[PDB]
């Protein structure tokens, strides 16, 4: 790795026109209002640590015939905010996890009545020897998983 792996850039579509870069060296990358979060985004609607991205080693079930993408790394997006975050088309409730693909647009906060719309664009610039970068490609087609004691533990020491 050169230093940066994933790029979360609060796009103009969102009230925020900034760019965030998740250093492959930092796992997991926390985002939210509180500076404690690797990423700094303060939106009264979201919690201190609205959500955080975590990278994990991608491993298939079996490979005694077919040749998959080997056991590399996959970047996951973890959500801990109450307002809920939305990844493209998958819902992200407090304690959820979803795979992030190069060019993944995640919604941190959306309000129809308040017109409060936030969202960052995930762009993988560097691939630290990844199976691809983070496009999933497995049993379930782009599905939002739930967080476990492992993920919750990462934020516990935030």
């Amino acid at each position: 790795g050169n230093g940066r792996f994933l790029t979360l850039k609060p796009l103009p579509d969102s009230i925020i026109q900034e760019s965030l870069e998740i250093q492959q060296g930092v796992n997991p990358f926390f985002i939210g209002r509180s500076e404690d979060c690797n990423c700094k985004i303060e939106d009264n609607r979201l919690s201190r640590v609205h959500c955080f991205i975590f990278k994990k080693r991608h491993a298939v079930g079996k490979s005694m015939y077919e040749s998959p993408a080997q056991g590399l790394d996959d970047i996951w997006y973890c959500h801990t905010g109450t307002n809920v975050s939305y990844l493209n088309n998958n819902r992200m409730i407090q304690g959820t996890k979803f795979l992030l693909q190069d060019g993944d647009e995640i919604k941190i906060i959306w309000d129809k009545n308040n017109k409060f719309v936030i969202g960052f664009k995930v762009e993988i610039n560097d691939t630290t020897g990844l199976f691809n970068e983070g496009l999933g490609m497995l049993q379930e087609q782009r599905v939002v998983l739930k967080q476990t004691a492992e993920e919750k533990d990462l934020v516990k020491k935030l």
Binding site: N44, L46, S47, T82, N83, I109, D111, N114
Partner: peptide, 9 residues
């Protein structure tokens, strides 16, 4: 002290 998440309706 600003500990309050403006949860939307």
């Amino acid at each position: 002290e600003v500990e309050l998440t403006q949860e939307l309706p």
